[PDB]
Every structure is written in C-alpha cells, then in structure tokens.
Amino acid sequence: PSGVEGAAFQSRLPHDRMTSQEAACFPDIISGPQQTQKVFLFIRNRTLQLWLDNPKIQLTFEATLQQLEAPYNSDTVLVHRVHSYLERHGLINFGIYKRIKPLPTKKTGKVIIIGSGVSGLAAARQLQSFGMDVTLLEARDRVGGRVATFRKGNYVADLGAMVVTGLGGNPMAVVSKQVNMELAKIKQKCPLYEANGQAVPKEKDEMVEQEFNRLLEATSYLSHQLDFNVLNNKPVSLGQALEVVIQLQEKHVKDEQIEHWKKIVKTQEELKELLNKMVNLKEKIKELHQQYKEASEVKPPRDITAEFLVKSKHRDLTALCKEYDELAETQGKLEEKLQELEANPPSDVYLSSRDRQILDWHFANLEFANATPLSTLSLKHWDQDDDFEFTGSHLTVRNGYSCVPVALAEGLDIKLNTAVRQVRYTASGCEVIAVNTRSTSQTFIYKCDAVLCTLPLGVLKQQPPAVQFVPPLPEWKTSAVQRMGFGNLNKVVLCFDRVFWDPSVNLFGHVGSTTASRGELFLFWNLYKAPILLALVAGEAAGIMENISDDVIVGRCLAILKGIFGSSAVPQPKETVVSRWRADPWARGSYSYVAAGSSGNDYDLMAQPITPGPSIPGAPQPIPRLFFAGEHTIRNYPATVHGALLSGLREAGRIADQFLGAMYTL
Amino acid sequence: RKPPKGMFLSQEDVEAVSANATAATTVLRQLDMELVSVKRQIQNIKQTNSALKEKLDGGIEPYRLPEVIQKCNARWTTEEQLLAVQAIRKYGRDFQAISDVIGNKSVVQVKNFFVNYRRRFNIDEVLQEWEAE
Numbered sequence: 022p023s024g025v026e027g028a029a030f031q032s033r034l035p036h037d038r039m040t041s042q043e044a045a046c047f048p049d050i051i052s053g054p055q056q057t058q059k060v061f062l063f064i065r066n067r068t069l070q071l072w073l074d075n076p077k078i079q080l081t082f083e084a085t086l087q088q089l090e091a092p093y094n095s096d097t098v099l100v101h102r103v104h105s106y107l108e109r110h111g112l113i114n115f116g117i118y119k120r121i122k123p124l125p126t127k128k129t130g131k132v133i134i135i136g137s138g139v140s141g142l143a144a145a146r147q148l149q150s151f152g153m154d155v156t157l158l159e160a161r162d163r164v165g166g167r168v169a170t171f172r173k174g175n176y177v178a179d180l181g182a183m184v185v186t187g188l189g190g191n192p193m194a195v196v197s198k199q200v201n202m203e204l205a206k207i208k209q210k211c212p213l214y215e216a217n218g219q220a221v222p223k224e225k226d227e228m229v230e231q232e233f234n235r236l237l238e239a240t241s242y243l244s245h246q247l248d249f250n251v252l253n254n255k256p257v258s259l260g261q262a263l264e265v266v267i268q269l270q271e272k273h274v275k276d277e278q279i280e281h282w283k284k285i286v287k288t289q290e291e292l293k294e295l296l297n298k299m300v301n302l303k304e305k306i307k308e309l310h311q312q313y314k315e316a317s318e319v320k321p322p323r324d325i326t327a328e329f330l331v332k333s334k335h336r337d338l339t340a341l342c343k344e345y346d347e348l349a350e351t352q353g354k355l356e357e358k359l360q361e362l363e364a365n366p367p368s369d370v371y372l373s374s375r376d377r378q379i380l381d382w383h384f385a386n387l388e389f390a391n392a393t394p395l396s397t398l399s400l401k402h403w404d405q406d407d408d409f410e411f412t413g414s415h416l417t418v419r420n421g422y423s424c425v426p427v428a429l430a431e432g433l434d435i436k437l438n439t440a441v442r443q444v445r446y447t448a449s450g451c452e453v454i455a456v457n458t459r460s461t462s463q464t465f466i467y468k469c470d471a472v473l474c475t476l477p478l479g480v481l482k483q484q485p486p487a488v489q490f491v492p493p494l495p496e497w498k499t500s501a502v503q504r505m506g507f508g509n510l511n512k513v514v515l516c517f518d519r520v521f522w523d524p525s526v527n528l529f530g531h532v533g534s535t536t537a538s539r540g541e542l543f544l545f546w547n548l549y550k551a552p553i554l555l556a557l558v559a560g561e562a563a564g565i566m567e568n569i570s571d572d573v574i575v576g577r578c579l580a581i582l583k584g585i586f587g588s589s590a591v592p593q594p595k596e597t598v599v600s601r602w603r604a605d606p607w608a609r610g611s612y613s614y615v616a617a618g619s620s621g622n623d624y625d626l627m628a629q630p631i632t633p634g635p636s637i638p639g640a641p642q643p644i645p646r647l648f649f650a651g652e653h654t655i656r657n658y659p660a661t662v663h664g665a666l667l668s669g670l671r672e673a674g675r676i677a678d679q680f681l682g683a684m685y686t687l
Numbered sequence: 688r689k690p691p692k693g694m695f696l697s698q699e700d701v702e703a704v705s706a707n708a709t710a711a712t713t714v715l716r717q718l719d720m721e722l723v724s725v726k727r728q729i730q731n732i733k734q735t736n737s738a739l740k741e742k743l744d745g746g747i748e749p750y751r752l753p754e755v756i757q758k759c760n761a762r763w764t765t766e767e768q769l770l771a772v773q774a775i776r777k778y779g780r781d782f783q784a785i786s787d788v789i790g791n792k793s794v795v796q797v798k799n800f801f802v803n804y805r806r807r808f809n810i811d812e813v814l815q816e817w818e819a820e
C-alpha cells in the first residue's frame with residue numbers, strides 16, 4: 022500500500038472503515054452520515070502517515086493541523102479528537118521520540134508496573150508520556166525479560182527473541198527507525214543432514230517437505246470440514262490429527278494394493294476357466310481326429326453312409342478347431358492383461374523409515390515454531406493468529422535484540438532486583454509487596470492507584486504461587502490461565518574463533534534418529550557476524566534437555582557438527598551458553614501457545630482488568646485497579662515482541678482513560 | 688471443500704480409525720492379512736494355470752485338416768442329395784453345418800433343398816427324429 026492508505030495498513034487498521042475501538046470513541050461519527058465518516062478516516066490516515074514519515078520527533082496537534090488541508094482541516098475540534106485518540110492508544114507518538122512540549126510539571130496518578138519486559142516498558146513509557154508517575158518492579162538484574170542477549174567481547178547472540186517477523190504492519194518498523202537496530206534478512210535455504218552426517222538428497226528433501234505441507238492442510242480439512250475436533254470428550258490436538266491423517270494415508274496405500282492384486286486373481290481365474298475349457302477341447306479334438314482317421318481308412322468305393330461319416334467327422338473336427346482357435350486366441354488377450362497389471366504395481370509403502378525420519382524433522386521445526394510438542398496444540402485454534410502475519414521477509418537483530426528494551430528503559434524509574442510477592446488491590450487503591458532478590462528479608466511496600474501486571478503466563482501458572490493476589494483472582498481469570506498453554510524452547514550458543522561452515526548458509530538442519538528425539542539439536546543458525554553457531558532444542562526434547570549439564574549438551578553439538586563437517590574441522594568453542602527457560606523462575610517457559618481445550622478467546626480473558634469489590638457495602642461501583650498486559654494478553658499477536666509491545670500500549674491507553682479522562686468523545 | 692490432491696480423508700474412514708485406541712493398528716493389520724491372503728492365492732492359481740498350460744503343449748497342430756477349397760456348384764447330384772438327408776438327420780436346421788458337409792452347396796441352396804425335396808424326402812419326419820436327440 023502507498024499514501025495515507027499505507028499509513029492505515031502500517032498501523033494495522035482498515036483504511037476505508039472505522040474500527041470498533043474508534044466506534045466507541047466517536048459514536049457520533051460512525052452513526053452519522055457517510056460523508057463525515059470519510060472525513061474522519063482521512064484525518065486518521067493522514068495523521069498516521071505524518072507520524073510514520075518521522076517517528077523520531079513527536080507529532081503534535083499544532084503540527085497535524087498545519088499539514089492538513091481543506092476541507093479536512095475545516096473542523097478543528099474533530100482533528101483535535103483524532104490526534105488525541107491516536108496519541109492515547111499508541112498509534113502515534115509511541116516508542117522513543119524527541120519531545121516537543123516538555124512534560125507536565127507535576128504528575129497525576131501513581132501506577133506500579135510489575136516486570137520490565139517489553140510489555141511493561143512500552144506501557145511505562147506511555148504513562149509517563151501522559152503525565153503519570155510510573156515505577157517498574159523487575160525481579161531480574163536487567164531489563165528486557167525474554168529479550169535476553171548474551172555479550173562477551175565481540176560475541177553477541179540472543180538467548181531469547183531474535184527475529185522480526187516482517188515489517189509490513191509491524192510496530193517494530195517504527196522502533197527500528199528510533200533504535201539503531203541492525204536488521205538482516207534470513208536466507209530461507211536450509212539443507213538437512215541425516216544422523217550419518219551426509220546431506221539429504223534433493224529428491225527426498227522436496228517430496229517429504231511437500232508431504233509435510235500436505236499433511237498439514239489435511240488436518241485443517243479434518244478440522245474445518247469434517248468437524249473432527251473432539252475425541253472421547255477430549256479436544257483433539259494437532260498431533261492427534263496428524264497421527265490420524267498419516268494412518269489414513271497408510272490405510273489407503275494398503276487398500277490400493279489389495280484392490281490391485283484383486284484385479285489379478287479376477288483375471289487369473291478367468292484364465293483358469295479359460296484353460297480348463299481348452300484342455301477339454303483339445304481332448305475332444307484328439308478323439309475326433311482319430312474317428313475321422315478311422316473313417317478315412319475305409320478304402321473306396323464306399324456307400325453314402327460311410328462317405329457321410331468322413332464328411333461329418335471332417336466338418337465337426339473343423340468346427341472344434343475353430344472353437345479352439347478362439348478359446349486359445351483369447352488366451353493371449355488375457356495373458357497381456359496379466360503382464361499389464363504385474364508390471365504397474367501401486368505404491369509399496371507410504372513413507373519408509375528413512376522418509377518418516379525426515380518428516381519428523383519438519384514436525385520438529387513445527388514444534389519449534391510453537392515451542393511445544395504437537396500433542397498439546399489445539400487442532401482448531403493453534404494457527405488462529407495466522408491471518409495477521411506481517412508482510413515482508415523475516416529479519417534478525419544482528420547487534421542483539423537487547424538494544425531495544427535498553428533503549429526503552431531510558432528515563433524510566435526502574436527498580437531492579439525487586440521480586441513482587443503479593444499484589445493487594447482494594448476499592449481505595451493498591452499496595453504491592455516485594456522483596457530484594459539478593460537478600461529476601463528486605464521488604465518493600467509500594468502504594469499506588471493502579472497495578473499493571475506483565476508477569477509471564479508461566480509465572481501466573483505456578484503452584485504454589487510465586488505471586489499471591491489479595492483478594493484472589495476470579496475464577497474466570499484463573500481458569501483462562503490454566504487453559505492457556507505456556508511452551509518452552511531453548512538455544513545453545515557456540516562461539517568460535519574461525520568459521521568452518523558455509524558462510525552463505527544461514528541455517529541447516531540435523532535429522533534426528535528417533536521420533537522422540539526429533540527436536541534435540543535439530544536446527545543450527547549462522548546469523549551473526551562473529552563466528553557463532555547456534556543450535557536449537559524443541560518439542561519434547563526441550564523440557565528433558567534442561568536436566569543435562571552444559572558440557573554434555575555442547576558435547577552432543579560437537580558430535581553432530583563433526584559428522585557434517587568432519588572431525589578435523591570442528592574446534593573447541595572457548596565460550597558456551599545454554600538457555601533453560603522453563604527452569605527460569607522469572608519466565609517458567611518460553612511463550613504461550615493455544616493449548617487443546619483453549620482458544621484465542623482466553624487471550625482476551627487474560628487482558629480483562631480486575632475490579633475490586635466495594636469497601637463499604639452499598640458503596641458505588643469501584644474503579645478497575647489491576648490491569649494485565651503482556652505477550653499472553655493479545656489475541657492477534659501472541660508469543661511475539663510486537664505483541665507484548667502492543668499490549669503495553671493498550672493498557673497504557675486504558676489506564677490513562679480511567680485515571681486522566683478522555684475529552685475526545687463529544 | 689476437498690482434501691489436498693493426494694490425501695484421502697472420507698468421513699467414514701476417520702471414524703473407523705478413531706473408534707478406539709488400537710483401532711488404527713487393527714485396521715492396518717486386517718489389511719495386511721487380506722493382502723497376504725490374496726497374494727498367496729495368486730501363486731496358487733499361477734501354479735494351477737502353469738500346469739494346465741503344459742497340458743496344451745503342442746497346440747492342436749497334429750489334429751488340423753487341410754482346407755478343402757472346392758468351387759460351389761448348383762446341380763444336386765444323386766450322391767449330394769443323399770449326403771444332405773443324413774446331414775439333416777444329424778444336424779437338424781443347422782444350414783451352415785449341412786453346407787460344409789456337402790461341400791459345394793451354399794447356405795441358401797441348402798435352405799431351398801429344405802422345400803423342393805421336403806415332399807419326396809420326408810424331411811419333416813427326418814427333422815422330427817432329430818428333435819428326439
């Protein structure tokens with residue numbers, strides 16, 4: 022898209038229709054005449070275009086009205102409402118921008134933010150931009166959360182997030198212009214190497230990859246066409262659907278063979294009756310010839326009965342030879358069909374053990390993308406966020422993704438090494454209790470008007486709780502936490518002194534030996550500048566590999582690389598780092614997935630804020646006090662950085678509309 | 688609307704493989720057995736036919752007679768008349784058979800004979816005594 026319409030696309034908005042959020046803030050326009058709606062939409066799209074053309078400076082209302090032209094700038098209070106709407110909800114003036122109007126002298130309202138991940142950092146930035154007092158409480162000794170970058174000397178490798186999934190509609194495109202990120206395209210080509218150490222032939226690499234892509238579309242047909250979503254009162258998982266689809270393919274292969282050999286016995290038995298008719302006809306001929314002979318031996322002259330006998334036997338013997346000349350003629354008509362069928366046999370097997378191993382690699386790559394074994398993903402809803410995929414190639418942060426949260430933390434009041442233990446919310450305010458992570462006896466008390474919780478879903482799942490809510494979270498909130506899936510995947514960083522791999526190959530795979538170990542060191546990455554190879558652990562291997570020491574994990578990596586590249590070409594790494602995200606007390610896993618029995622609607626439940634009960638009985642309905650942002654709270658972009666980034670902007674707009682007002686509704 | 692070309696997913700098949708736990712292994716075994724069953728029946732008939740093939744070794748060539756090609760004639764000799772009566776007694780109304788026995792009489796000439804001499808040769812009695820066989 023181009024022009025003001027591209028601005029709307031780049032802001033994830035329909036360029037020619039008001040959204041539901043806009044309808045709530047401008048109910049007089051969406052219910053009004055069509056002419057006003059088109060004016061409003063252009064004002065919104067034009068304001069977005071201006072901000073996106075210069076995301077480094079703040080877009081003020083005085084500046085927006087200057088670039089607008091008649092008749093769109095004739096109504097000024099409408100332009101002012103649109104600008105204030107976009108600024109409040111993080112569509113313009115978000116991220117890291119030089120401020121034009123110095124901030125309010127004194128702040129309004131106190132907000133405590135739990136966790137200084139991208140989710141919390143984005144919200145803290147905005148709430149301070151809106152003139153509120155914001156303080157973030159981070160349990161770790163650093164910012165970024167699951168944006169964790171390893172740095173030692175020249176070595177830079179990300180243990181958490183490292184890929185921007187396209188820039189088309191990605192808010193990270195705005196950030197990448199503000200922060201000096203070093204985005205580099207990922208070359209898609211990814212050769213596979215079997216356990217023997219040699220590469221997979223191009224014949225197999227494509228027939229299996231296509232069969233994998235085919236098996237996947239099959240499960241979607243199983244789900245959305247045959248309504249195969251429940252199996253014995255339990256929700257079907259994507260792993261189960263693949264097992265069923267595969268078995269049906271092996272079942273059809275066997276039915277093809279049985280009906281093919283059944284064509285042979287049918288024609289073979291036509292031959293059995295055909296031969297039995299001629300072996301008996303050759304017998305009648307053998308007897309008739311002897312009778313014609315004996316009648317012909319009678320030497321002339323002979324009466325007309327002896328002469329009729331020779332003529333009679335001659336005619337009958339000629340007729341029986343005609344009947345044989347056809348019964349034995351069709352003997353070749355069927356003998357060709359037999360060499361026909363016995364030369365075009367159907368497929369012997371669906372997939373061999375060698376093929377099924379390579380297919381398991383593509384399953385491992387899928388278990389990697391969703392950070393959970395396929396047996397846990399919801400068959401119907403696991404790819405519910407696919408319709409919002411961004412456009413463009415996927416890029417890596419070559420200088421380390423940590424530069425983004427570090428850049429956001431500039432100017433914010435962050436309290437590191439502060440682990441929240443208890444969140445108390447009542448009708449008259451909130452208080453957060455936290456202890457210092459270095460000596461857990463030192464207790465801190467933070468009073469505030471509102472708490473924004475960006476705790477990872479894996480932390481919200483702990484039993485017994487790491488964070489106690491007082492009063493307890495309502496069932497509908499906790500039930501969503503239990504239904505939602507929180508997966509796991511780990512990275513192994515192998516630094517080196519020289520490059521022994523192919524520089525033009527950004528990634529290559531390792532086909533495991535067993536279905537069980539298919540995710541164990543299956544993928545390798547050459548995506549950084551310094552000689553660093555990075556190996557991935559996915560699926561059921563992820564959780565099990567955390568119970569293994571670093572020197573043994575790196576030992577399996579070198580053993581694999583010695584197979585592909587040779588034992589002489591693999592040196593010692595001199596620096597190794599292995600992640601253990603499920604064991605991390607501050608993450609308890611990698612990111613969320615749509616578990617079977619859950620749906621994307623649980624993400625919306627996670628995002629709903631909590632409102633305390635009245636202090637005095639009969640007191641008016643209180644104000645929402647506990648707010649939830651984070652990767653697991655945004656239905657259309659879960660498990661990402663841009664999703665956490667957006668969720669933070671969301672709650673920052675909601676918390677502001679609650680405690681500061683919204684003068685853009687009349 | 689339809690599965691990916693090459694996949695086979697009918698509503699009936701899915702239920703038979705998910706009816707219980709080991710219903711998958713059960714269906715794939717009863718097809719493995721029905722395959723082994725049909726395969727050994729092939730080699731049973733392939734051997735029964737191979738034995739019958741060797742009984743035909745030699746064709747019927749020692750039993751074929753040369754083609755006596757005689758030009759068709761129109762005059763019924765006394766001999767040829769007598770051949771026709773016996774041919775009627777043995778073959779009935781098979782005109783092609785009677786034509787071949789006599790040798791030089793067409794199918795329609797044999798039929799004309801069935802009326803011209805039906806009076807004098809009692810062909811009605813000859814035919815009715817053929818019908819007793």
Ligand SMILES: Cc1cc2nc3c(=O)[nH]c(=O)nc-3n(C[C@H](O)[C@H](O)[C@H](O)COP(=O)(O)OP(=O)(O)OC[C@H]3O[C@@H](n4cnc5c(N)ncnc54)[C@H](O)[C@@H]3O)c2cc1C
Nearest residue numbers: 136138139140160166167181182183184441651652661662
């Ligand atoms: C291995 C891996 C690779 C990934 N790769 C990508 C990728 O390529 N692209 C992408 O878009 N996304 C990726 N992600 C996911 C992405 O990093 C997350 O979705 C995002 O960082 C989550 O942000 P958040 O602020 O919601 O959560 P977090 O970043 O986890 O922030 C929560 C913060 O709260 C803190 N905290 C926890 N407990 C307490 C407590 N008791 N008291 C106080 N503070 C606490 C935590 O330390 C943390 O700093 C990846 C994730 C993993 C694990």
Ligand SMILES: CCn1c(C(=O)Nc2cccc(COC)c2COc2ccc(OC[C@@H]3CCNC3)cc2)cc2sccc21
Nearest residue numbers: 184186207209389390391406415528613614659660661662
């Ligand atoms: C698997 C980690 N991950 C990655 C990643 O590692 N991508 C990557 C790395 C090397 C080579 C290639 C190959 O280049 C194409 C890729 C892209 O493969 C993807 C994997 C998962 C994706 O989406 C994951 C989220 C989880 C829940 N819904 C989507 C998207 C792309 C990107 C994103 S966005 C959220 C997680 C994530």
